Short mmCIF file of C-alpha atoms in Angstrom, two decimals:
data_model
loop_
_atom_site.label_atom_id
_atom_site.label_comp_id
_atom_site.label_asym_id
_atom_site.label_seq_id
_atom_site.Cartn_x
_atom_site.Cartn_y
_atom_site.Cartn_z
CA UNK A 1 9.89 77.93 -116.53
CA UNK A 2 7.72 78.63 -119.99
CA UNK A 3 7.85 78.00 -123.24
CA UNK A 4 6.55 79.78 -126.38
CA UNK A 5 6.57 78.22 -130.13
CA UNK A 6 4.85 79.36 -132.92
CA UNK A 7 2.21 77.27 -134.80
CA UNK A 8 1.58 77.37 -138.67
CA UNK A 9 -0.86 76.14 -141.29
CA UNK A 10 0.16 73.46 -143.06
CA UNK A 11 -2.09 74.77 -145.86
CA UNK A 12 -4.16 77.22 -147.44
CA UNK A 13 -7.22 75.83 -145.78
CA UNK A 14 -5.88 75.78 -142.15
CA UNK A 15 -6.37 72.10 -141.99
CA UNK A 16 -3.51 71.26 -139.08
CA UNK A 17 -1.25 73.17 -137.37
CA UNK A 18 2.41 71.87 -136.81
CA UNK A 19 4.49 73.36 -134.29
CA UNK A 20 8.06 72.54 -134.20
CA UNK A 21 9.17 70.24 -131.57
CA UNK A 22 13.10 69.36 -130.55
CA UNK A 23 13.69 65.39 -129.49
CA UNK A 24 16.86 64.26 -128.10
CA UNK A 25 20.45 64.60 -128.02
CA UNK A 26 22.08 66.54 -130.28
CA UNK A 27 18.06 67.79 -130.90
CA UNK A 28 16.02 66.20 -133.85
CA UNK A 29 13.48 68.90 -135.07
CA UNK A 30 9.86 67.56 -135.93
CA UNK A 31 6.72 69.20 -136.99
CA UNK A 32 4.15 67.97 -134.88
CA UNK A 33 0.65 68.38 -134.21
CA UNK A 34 -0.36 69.63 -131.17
CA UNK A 35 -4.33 67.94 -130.33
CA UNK A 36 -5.77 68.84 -127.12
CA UNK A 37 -7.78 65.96 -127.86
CA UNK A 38 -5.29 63.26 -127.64
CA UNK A 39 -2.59 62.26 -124.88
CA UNK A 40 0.07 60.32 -126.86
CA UNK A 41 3.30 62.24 -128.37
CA UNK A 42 4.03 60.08 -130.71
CA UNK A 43 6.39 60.15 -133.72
CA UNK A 44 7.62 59.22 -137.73
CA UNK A 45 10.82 56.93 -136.99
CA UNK A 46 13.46 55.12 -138.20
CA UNK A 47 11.29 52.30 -136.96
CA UNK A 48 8.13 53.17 -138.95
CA UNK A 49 7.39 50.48 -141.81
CA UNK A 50 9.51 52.23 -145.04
CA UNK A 51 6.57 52.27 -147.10
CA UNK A 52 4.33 54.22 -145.22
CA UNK A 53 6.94 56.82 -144.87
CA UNK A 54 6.43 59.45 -147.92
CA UNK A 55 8.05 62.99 -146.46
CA UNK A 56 8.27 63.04 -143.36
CA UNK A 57 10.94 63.91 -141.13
CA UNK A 58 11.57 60.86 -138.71
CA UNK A 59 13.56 60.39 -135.09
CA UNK A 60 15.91 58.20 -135.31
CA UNK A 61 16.70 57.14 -131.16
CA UNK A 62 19.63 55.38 -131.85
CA UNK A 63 21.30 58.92 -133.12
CA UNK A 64 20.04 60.54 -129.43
CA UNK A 65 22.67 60.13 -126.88
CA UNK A 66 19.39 60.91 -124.38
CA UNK A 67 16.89 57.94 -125.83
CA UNK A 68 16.07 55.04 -123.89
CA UNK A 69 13.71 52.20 -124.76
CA UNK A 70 11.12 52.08 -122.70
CA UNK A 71 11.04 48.04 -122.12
CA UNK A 72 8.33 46.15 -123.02
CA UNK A 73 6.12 48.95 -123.53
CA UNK A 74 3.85 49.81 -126.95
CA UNK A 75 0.97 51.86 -128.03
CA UNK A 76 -1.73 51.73 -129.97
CA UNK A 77 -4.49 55.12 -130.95
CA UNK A 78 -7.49 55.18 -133.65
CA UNK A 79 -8.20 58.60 -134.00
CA UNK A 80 -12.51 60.30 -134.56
CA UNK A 81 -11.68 60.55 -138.13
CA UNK A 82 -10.50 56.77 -138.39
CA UNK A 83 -6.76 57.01 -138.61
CA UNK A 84 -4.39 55.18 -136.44
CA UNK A 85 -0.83 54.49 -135.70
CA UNK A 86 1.04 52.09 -133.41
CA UNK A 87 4.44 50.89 -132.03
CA UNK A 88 6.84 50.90 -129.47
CA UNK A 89 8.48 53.88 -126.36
CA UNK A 90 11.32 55.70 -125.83
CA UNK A 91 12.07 57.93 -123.47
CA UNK A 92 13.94 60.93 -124.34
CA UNK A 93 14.19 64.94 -123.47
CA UNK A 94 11.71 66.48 -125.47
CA UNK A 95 11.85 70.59 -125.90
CA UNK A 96 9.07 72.94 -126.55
CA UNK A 97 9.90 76.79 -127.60
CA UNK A 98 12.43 76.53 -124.82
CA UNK A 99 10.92 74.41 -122.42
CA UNK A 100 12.27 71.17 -121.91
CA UNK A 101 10.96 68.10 -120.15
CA UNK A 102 13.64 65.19 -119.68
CA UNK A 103 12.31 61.29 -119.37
CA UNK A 104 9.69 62.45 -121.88
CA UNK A 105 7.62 59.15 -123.87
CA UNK A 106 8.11 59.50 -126.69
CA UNK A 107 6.00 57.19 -128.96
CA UNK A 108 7.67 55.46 -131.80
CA UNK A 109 5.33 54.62 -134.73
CA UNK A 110 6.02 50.96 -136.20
CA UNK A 111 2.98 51.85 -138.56
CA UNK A 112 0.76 54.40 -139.26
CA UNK A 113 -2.58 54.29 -141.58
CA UNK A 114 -2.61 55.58 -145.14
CA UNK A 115 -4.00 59.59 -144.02
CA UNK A 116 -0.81 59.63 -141.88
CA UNK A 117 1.70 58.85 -144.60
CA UNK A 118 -0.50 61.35 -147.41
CA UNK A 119 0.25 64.11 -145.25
CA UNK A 120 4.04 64.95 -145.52
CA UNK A 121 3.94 68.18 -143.53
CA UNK A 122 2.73 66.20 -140.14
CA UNK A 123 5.86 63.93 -138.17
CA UNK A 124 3.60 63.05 -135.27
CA UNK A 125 1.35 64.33 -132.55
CA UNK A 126 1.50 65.98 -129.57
CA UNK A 127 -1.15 65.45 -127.69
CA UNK A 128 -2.27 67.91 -124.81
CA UNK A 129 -5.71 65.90 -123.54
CA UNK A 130 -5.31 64.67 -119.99
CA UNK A 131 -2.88 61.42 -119.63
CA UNK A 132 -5.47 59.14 -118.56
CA UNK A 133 -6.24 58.87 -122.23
CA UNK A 134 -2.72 58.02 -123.18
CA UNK A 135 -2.60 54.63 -124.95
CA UNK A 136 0.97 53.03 -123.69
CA UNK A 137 0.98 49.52 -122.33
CA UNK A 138 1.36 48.15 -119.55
CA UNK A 139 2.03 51.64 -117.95
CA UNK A 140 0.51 54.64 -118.75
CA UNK A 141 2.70 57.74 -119.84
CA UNK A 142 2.13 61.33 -118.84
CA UNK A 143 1.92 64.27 -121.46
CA UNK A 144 4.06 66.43 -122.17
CA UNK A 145 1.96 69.12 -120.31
CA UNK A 146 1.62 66.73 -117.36
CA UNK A 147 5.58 66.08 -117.32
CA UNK A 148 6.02 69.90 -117.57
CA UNK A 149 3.52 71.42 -115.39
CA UNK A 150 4.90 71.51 -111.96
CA UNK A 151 8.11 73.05 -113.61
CA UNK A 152 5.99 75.77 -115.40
CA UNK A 153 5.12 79.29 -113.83
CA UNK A 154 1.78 78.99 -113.43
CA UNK A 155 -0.11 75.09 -114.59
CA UNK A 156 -1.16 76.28 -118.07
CA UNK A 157 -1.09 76.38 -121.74
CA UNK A 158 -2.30 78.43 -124.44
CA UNK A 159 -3.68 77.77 -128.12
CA UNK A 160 -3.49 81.25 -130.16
CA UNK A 161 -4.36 79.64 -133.55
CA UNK A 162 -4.37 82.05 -136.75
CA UNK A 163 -6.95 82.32 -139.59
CA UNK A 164 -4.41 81.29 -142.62
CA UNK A 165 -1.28 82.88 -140.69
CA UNK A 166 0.74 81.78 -137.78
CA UNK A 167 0.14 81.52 -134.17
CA UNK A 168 1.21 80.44 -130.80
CA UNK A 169 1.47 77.91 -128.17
CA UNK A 170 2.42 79.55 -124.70
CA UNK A 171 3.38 76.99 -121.87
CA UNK A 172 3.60 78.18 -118.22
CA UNK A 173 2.25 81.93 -119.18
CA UNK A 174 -0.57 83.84 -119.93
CA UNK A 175 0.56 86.65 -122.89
CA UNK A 176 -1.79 89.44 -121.98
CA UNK A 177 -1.27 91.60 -125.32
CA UNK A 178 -2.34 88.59 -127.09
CA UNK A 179 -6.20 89.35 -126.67
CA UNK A 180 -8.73 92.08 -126.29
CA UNK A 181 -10.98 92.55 -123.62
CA UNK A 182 -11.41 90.25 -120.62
CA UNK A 183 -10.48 86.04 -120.42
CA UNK A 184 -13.74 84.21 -119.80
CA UNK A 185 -13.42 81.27 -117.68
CA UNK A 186 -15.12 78.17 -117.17
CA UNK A 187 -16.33 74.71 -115.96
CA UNK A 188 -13.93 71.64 -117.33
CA UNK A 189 -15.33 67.86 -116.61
CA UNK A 190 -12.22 65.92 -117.14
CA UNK A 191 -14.51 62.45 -116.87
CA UNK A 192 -13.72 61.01 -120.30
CA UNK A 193 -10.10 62.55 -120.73
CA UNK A 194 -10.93 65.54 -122.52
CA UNK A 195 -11.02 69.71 -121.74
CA UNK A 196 -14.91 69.40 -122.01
CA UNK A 197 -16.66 72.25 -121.07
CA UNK A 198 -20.30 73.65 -121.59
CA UNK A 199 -21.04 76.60 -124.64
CA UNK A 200 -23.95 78.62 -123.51
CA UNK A 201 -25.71 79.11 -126.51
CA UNK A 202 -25.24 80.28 -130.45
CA UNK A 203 -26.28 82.94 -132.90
CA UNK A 204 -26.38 82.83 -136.77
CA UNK A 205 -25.12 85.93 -138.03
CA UNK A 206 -26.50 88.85 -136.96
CA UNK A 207 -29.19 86.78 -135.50
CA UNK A 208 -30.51 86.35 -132.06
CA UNK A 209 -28.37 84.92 -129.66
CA UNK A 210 -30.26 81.32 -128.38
CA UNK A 211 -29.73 80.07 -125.03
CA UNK A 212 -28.72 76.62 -124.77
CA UNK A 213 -26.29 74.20 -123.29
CA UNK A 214 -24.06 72.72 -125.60
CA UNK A 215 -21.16 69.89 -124.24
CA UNK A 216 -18.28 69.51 -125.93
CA UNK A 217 -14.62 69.60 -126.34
CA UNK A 218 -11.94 71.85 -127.10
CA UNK A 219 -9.88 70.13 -129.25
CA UNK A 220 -6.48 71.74 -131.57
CA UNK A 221 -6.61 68.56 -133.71
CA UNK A 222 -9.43 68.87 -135.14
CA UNK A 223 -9.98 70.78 -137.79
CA UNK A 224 -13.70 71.83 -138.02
CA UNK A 225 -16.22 72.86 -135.86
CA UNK A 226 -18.90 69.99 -134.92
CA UNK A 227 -22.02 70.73 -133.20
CA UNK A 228 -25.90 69.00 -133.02
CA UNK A 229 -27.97 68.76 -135.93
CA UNK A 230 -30.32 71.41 -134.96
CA UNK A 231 -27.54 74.26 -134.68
CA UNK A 232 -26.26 73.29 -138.06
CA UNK A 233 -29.11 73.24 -139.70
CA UNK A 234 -29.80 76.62 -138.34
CA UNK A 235 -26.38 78.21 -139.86
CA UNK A 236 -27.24 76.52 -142.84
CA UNK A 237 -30.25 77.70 -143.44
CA UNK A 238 -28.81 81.09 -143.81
CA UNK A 239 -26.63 80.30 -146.68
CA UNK A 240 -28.82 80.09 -150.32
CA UNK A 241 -28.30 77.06 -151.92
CA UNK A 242 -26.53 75.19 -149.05
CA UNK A 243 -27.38 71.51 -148.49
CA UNK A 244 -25.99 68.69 -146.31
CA UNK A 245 -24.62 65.87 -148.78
CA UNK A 246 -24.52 62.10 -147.87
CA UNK A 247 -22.28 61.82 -151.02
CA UNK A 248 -19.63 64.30 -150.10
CA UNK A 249 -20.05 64.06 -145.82
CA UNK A 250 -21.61 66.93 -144.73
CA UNK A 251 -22.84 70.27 -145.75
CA UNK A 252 -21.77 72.06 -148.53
CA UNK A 253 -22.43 75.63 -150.25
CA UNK A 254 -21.84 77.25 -153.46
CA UNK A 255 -18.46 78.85 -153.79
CA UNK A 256 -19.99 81.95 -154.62
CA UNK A 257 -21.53 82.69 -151.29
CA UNK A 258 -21.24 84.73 -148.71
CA UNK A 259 -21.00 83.21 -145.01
CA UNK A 260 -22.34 84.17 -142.36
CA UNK A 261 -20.31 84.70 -138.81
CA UNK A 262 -21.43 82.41 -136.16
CA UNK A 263 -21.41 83.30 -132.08
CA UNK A 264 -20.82 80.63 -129.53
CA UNK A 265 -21.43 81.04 -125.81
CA UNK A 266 -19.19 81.62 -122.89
CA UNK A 267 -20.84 81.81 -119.79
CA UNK A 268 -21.99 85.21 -120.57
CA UNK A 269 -19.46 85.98 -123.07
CA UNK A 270 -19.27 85.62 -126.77
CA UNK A 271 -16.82 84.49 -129.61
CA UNK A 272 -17.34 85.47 -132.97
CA UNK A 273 -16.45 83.21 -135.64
CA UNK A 274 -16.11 85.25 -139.44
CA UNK A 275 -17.55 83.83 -141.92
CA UNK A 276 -14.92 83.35 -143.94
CA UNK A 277 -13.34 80.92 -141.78
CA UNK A 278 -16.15 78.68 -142.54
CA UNK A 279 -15.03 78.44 -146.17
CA UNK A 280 -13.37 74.94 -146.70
CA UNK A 281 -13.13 75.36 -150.41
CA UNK A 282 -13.82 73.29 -153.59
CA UNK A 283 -14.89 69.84 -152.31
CA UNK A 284 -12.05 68.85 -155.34
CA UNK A 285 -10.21 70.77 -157.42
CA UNK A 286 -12.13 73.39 -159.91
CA UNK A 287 -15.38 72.54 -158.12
CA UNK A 288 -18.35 75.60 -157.52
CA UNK A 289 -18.74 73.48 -154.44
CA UNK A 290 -17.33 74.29 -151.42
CA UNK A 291 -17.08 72.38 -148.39
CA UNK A 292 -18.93 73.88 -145.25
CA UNK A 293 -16.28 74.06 -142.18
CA UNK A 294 -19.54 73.98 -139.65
CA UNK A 295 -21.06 70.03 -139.70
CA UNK A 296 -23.12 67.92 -138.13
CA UNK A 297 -21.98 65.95 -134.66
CA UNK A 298 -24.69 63.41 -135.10
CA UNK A 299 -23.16 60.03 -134.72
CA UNK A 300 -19.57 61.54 -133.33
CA UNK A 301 -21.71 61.09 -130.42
CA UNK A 302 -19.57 64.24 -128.92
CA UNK A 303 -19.47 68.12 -129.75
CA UNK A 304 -16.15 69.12 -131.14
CA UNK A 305 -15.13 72.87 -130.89
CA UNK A 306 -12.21 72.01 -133.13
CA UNK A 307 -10.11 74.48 -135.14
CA UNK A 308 -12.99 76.91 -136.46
CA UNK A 309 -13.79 77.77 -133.40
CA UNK A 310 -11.06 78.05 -131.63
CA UNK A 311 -8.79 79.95 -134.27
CA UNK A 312 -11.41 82.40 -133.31
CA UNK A 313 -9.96 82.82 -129.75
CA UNK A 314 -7.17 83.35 -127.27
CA UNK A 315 -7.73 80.04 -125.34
CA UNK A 316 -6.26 79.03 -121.99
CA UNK A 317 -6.59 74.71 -120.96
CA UNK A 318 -5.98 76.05 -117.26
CA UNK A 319 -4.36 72.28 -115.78
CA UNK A 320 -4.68 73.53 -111.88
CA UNK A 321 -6.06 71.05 -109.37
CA UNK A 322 -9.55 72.08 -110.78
CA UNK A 323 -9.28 72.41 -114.37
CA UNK A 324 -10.85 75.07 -116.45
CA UNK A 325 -10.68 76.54 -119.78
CA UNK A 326 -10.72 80.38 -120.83
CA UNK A 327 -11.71 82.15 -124.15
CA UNK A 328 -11.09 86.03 -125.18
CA UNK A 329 -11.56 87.37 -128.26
CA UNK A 330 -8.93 88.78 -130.02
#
């Protein structure tokens, strides 16, 4: 089997991407949030406390002829940027752009912290990180990948995320008009949950490419690119006026400048990164400054290829025996 949805900006910025997802019987559409660097699908209910609900489109498992509770079983996930949710399992047939996995968890939030319930474009998450990360108690729940993936053609997915447009999320296929060139592959370390890999190095611009090893994560649910203090301070550098703020969190730049491109590193391949999709606009409204979408990792205490960089790619989160992930440009 496969699958194929199409992913869209909730915004202007490109902050999230939410990909329709259809749960139970008859279906119940919700946007979610696909994060390759969580393992819990997990979901606006009926169930979720009715003032932290402001938007959203919630599943309702008593109307699903296919929903089961999941007895005596609850989660509980604080995400890198300090939100969080929590409550109790169902299980239920979940469907992806045609795909469908039956006896799927599916996470029903009880509460969910204030970010959650500002943003009324996101109904949940669907998280695409490897299932020893997932967060249910006393037993641990599979992904939907991991539920899928001996179903699927061949044991992969594929983030095609677009610079203020849509894209795609392929299951069980890889779509070869969707990239130029050749797929790079490489090393995945799967030791604390994640598709970490290993960038080979960086340029600034039209700069010299450096040589380095970088660790860190790909990761759909996060919006920005975060990488060591050194490299940042190198892209930085190259933009006039740009400083890193402790008041606003992180670099910014005046509006009126023009970005650079930045190059990361696989194995001998490279992935350019426009400028322009470092721009994260005004830090508030009618502001000259604008917020940088290239920041500091220190004290993350991980790199995090998030959004920036991989909007920049075709990516492939290869879940054979071995995993492995692949970049082309595009």
């Amino acid at each position: 089997s496969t699958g194929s949805a199409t992913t869209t900006p909730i915004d202007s910025l490109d902050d999230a991407y939410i990909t329709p997802v259809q749960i139970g019987t008859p279906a119940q559409t919700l946007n979610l949030d696909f994060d390759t660097g969580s393992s819990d699908l997990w979901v606006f209910s009926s169930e979720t406390t009715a003032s932290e609900v402001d938007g959203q489109t919630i599943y309702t498992p008593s109307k699903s002829t296919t929903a089961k509770l999941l007895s005596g079983a609850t989660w509980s996930i604080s995400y890198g940027d300090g939100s969080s949710s929590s409550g109790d399992v169902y299980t239920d047939t979940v469907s992806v752009g045609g795909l469908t996995v039956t006896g799927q968890a599916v996470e029903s939030a009880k509460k969910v912290s204030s970010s959650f319930t500002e943003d009324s474009t996101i109904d949940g998450l669907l998280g695409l990180a490897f299932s020893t990360l997932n967060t249910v108690s006393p037993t641990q729940q599979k992904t939907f990948f991991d539920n899928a993936k001996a179903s699927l053609d061949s044991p992969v997915f594929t983030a095609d995320l677009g610079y203020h447009a849509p894209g795609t999320y392929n299951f069980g296929f890889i779509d070869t008009t969707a990239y130029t060139g050749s797929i790079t592959y490489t090393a995945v370390s799967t030791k604390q949950g994640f598709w970490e890999w290993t960038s080979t190095g960086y340029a600034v611009g039209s700069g010299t490419f450096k040589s380095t090893s970088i660790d860190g994560i790909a990761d759909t649910g996060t919006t920005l690119l975060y990488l060591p203090a050194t490299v940042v301070s190198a892209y930085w550098a190259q933009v006039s006026g740009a400083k890193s703020s402790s008041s606003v969190g992180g670099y910014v730049f005046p509006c009126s400048a023009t970005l650079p491109s930045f190059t990361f590193g696989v194995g001998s391949a490279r992935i350019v990164i426009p400028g322009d999709y470092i721009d994260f606009g005004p830090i508030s409204t009618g502001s000259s400054s604008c917020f940088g979408g290239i920041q500091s990792s220190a004290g993350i205490g991980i790199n995090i290829f998030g959004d920036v960089a991989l909007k920049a790619a075709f990516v492939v989160f290869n879940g054979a025996t071995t995993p492995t992930l692949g970049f082309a440009s595009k």
